Amino acid sequence: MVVTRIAPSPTGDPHVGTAYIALFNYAWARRNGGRFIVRIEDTDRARYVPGAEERILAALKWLGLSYDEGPDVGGPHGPYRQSERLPLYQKYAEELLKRGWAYRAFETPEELEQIRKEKGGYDGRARNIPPEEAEERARRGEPHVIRLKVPRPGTTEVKDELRGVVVYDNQEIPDVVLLKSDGYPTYHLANVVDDHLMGVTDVIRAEEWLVSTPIHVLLYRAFGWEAPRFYHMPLLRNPDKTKISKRKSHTSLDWYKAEGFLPEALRNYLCLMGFSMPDGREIFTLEEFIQAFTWERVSLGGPVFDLEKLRWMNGKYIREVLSLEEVAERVKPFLREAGLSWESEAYLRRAVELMRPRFDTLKEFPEKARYLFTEDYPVSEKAQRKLEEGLPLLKELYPRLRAQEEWTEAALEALLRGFAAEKGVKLGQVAQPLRAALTGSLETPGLFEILALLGKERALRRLERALA
RNA sequence: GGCCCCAUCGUCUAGCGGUUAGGACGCGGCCCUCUCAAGGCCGAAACGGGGGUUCGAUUCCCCCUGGGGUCACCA
Numbered sequence: 119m120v121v122t123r124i125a126p127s128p129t130g131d132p133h134v135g136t137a138y139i140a141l142f143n144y145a146w147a148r149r150n151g152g153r154f155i156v157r158i159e160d161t162d163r164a165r166y167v168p169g170a171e172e173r174i175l176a177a178l179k180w181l182g183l184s185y186d187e188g189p190d191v192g193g194p195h196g197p198y199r200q201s202e203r204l205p206l207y208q209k210y211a212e213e214l215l216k217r218g219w220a221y222r223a224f225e226t227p228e229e230l231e232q233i234r235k236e237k238g239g240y241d242g243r244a245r246n247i248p249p250e251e252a253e254e255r256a257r258r259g260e261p262h263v264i265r266l267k268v269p270r271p272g273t274t275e276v277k278d279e280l281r282g283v284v285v286y287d288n289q290e291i292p293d294v295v296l297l298k299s300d301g302y303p304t305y306h307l308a309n310v311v312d313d314h315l316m317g318v319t320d321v322i323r324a325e326e327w328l329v330s331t332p333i334h335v336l337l338y339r340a341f342g343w344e345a346p347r348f349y350h351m352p353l354l355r356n357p358d359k360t361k362i363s364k365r366k367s368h369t370s371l372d373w374y375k376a377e378g379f380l381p382e383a384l385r386n387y388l389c390l391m392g393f394s395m396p397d398g399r400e401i402f403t404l405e406e407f408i409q410a411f412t413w414e415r416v417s418l419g420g421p422v423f424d425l426e427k428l429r430w431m432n433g434k435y436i437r438e439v440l441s442l443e444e445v446a447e448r449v450k451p452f453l454r455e456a457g458l459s460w461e462s463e464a465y466l467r468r469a470v471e472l473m474r475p476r477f478d479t480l481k482e483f484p485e486k487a488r489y490l491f492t493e494d495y496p497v498s499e500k501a502q503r504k505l506e507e508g509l510p511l512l513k514e515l516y517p518r519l520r521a522q523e524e525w526t527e528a529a530l531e532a533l534l535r536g537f538a539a540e541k542g543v544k545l546g547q548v549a550q551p552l553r554a555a556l557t558g559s560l561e562t563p564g565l566f567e568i569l570a571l572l573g574k575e576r577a578l579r580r581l582e583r584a585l586a
Numbered sequence: 587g588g589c590c591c592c593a594u595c596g597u598c599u600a601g602c603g604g605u606u607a608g609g610a611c612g613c614g615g616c617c618c619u620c621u622c623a624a625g626g627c628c629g630a631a632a633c634g635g636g637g638g639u640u641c642g643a644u645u646c647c648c649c650c651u652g653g654g655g656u657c658a659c660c661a
């Protein structure tokens with residue numbers, strides 16, 4: 119069948135590039151009724167960040183992805199954390215040693231640096247150490263690493279399903295270390311061992327790994343295992359076209375969640391990086407994406423992540439994909455965070471309804487409609503000027519307002535329309551200043567709905583402080 | 587610098603020999619209108635350069651250029 123995986127390294131914030139890749143592995147697996155695996159690649163104890171694992175795992179679920187096997191969902195080929203698989207890599211490294219597909223090298227990092235400075239890269243000098251001597255020095259406990267013994271001279275063919283065949287000359291392939299002197303494996307060794315033991319048949323990862331694939335093809339040969347298919351996706355880019363990074367772009371998935379982007383929208387935007395629906399449609403569900411997925415519709419250029427288009431899509435989701443109620447619910451955390459409270463579900467729902475076409479992120483809602491939940495709201499200088507210019511007619515309208523029994527949008531409008539007419543003046547000449555008094559802003563939703571919202575008492579009560 | 591990948595509007599992209607080279611974001615205008623948005627309509631905006639192949643290339647091949655990646659006991 120088809121078995122895919124996402125192999126995040128817990129070394130920092132949950133990365134958007136990881137979400138992007140996970141997304142296509144998930145679709146390919148599901149599209150073929152296969153299995154999507156999560157394997158935590160925590161082999162670099164120096165860069166390992168505690169708490170990073172939970173964060174990427176939580177973020178993948180937040181985005182809407184589900185995995186069939188992994189650290190927290192079980193699976194028949196665990197552990198799904200490489201740090202817990204050390205004896206396994208050890209065993210396989212030693213097997214390569216015995217097959218004469220690798221050798222022990224005992225150079226100190228300082229020496230390797232010198233070698234690199236003199237000849238560039240490693241010259242594979244340790245291959246000249248007698249096998250028995252190497253084993254003896256190993257038993258004595260002399261620190262060392264185990265390196266891949268590349269067949270020299272030679273050539274190595276890699277097959278990328280999206281770009282065709284690429285033939286590397288072994289002189290371009292270094293005798294990479296397979297097992298570090300701390301007993302930990304390097305990415306290359308653990309990747310091939312685990313992909314094979316976990317049954318991965320389709321390796322989908324970012325293009326940054328294409329050049330290292332020949333190393334993997336050689337490892338599969340050394341172990342005598344069948345290589346899986348390889349699909350290298352393009353790298354997400356910063357505005358300047360360099361691969362997306364923390365200092366030039368927001369690469370943390372937690373940042374997106376904290377900023378009020380809907381996971382559904384972010385995921386939908388991510389699907390547009392290197393992929394498109396047959397009919398050009400831009401808004402679609404995760405399930406629709408799975409069904410339409412085809413490698414024929416995947417484009418290879420490096421896409422720049424456009425925060426602006428993402429915000430547009432998030433606003434699109436907010437007003438046309440989700441229902442009023444879903445938005446109302448997803449807005450609560452952000453109200454709380456802003457220290458704002460809402461009277462009841464009915465009030466909140468109506469407030470969200472009035473602001474729906476006016477906010478692209480859940481975070482903008484508490485910011486642009488603060489005056490709807492608290493008396494602690496700012497009044498713009500421009501709102502203040504409009505308020506003063508209209509004080510005279512408001513003073514006159516005030517009593518009419520307090521005379522209104524049916525405090526309804528339909529009624530209030532008729533009342534105001536009349537007041538502006540009998541005063542031989544345009545509605546705006548009264549609407550704008552009333553808006554400023556009611557909200558402290560001159561950019562809000564319709565006046566009648568804003569006036570109606572709080573109810574007679576609250577409306578006039580606030581109007582009074584203004585006329586005061 | 588060596589090797590490898592890539593190349594249509596500013597950005598994401600459709601196209602897969604013949605099109606007025608289409609859509610979307612963003613940008614400009616108009617409509618709508620009590621403000622601001624939302625929405626509708628209109629508009630400006632691209633095939634990097636040079637050779638080929640072919641009746642005919644945005645599309646097929648080659649070089650150049652540009653961008654990206656990789657040359658760690660990081661992944």
Ligand SMILES: Nc1ncnc2c1ncn2[C@@H]1O[C@H](COP(=O)([O-])OC[C@@H]([NH3+])CCC(=O)[O-])[C@@H](O)[C@H]1O
Binds near residue numbers: 127138353355362
């Ligand atoms: N800027 C970027 N744009 C697009 N994709 C990006 C990316 N940065 C990382 N990736 C990709 O996300 C996945 C996770 O990467 P990572 O957590 O850095 O470690 C990935 C490696 N541990 C395993 C790679 C593999 O063999 O599949 C990987 O599969 C990697 O390709």
Ligand SMILES: [Mg+2]
């Ligand atoms: Mg045009």
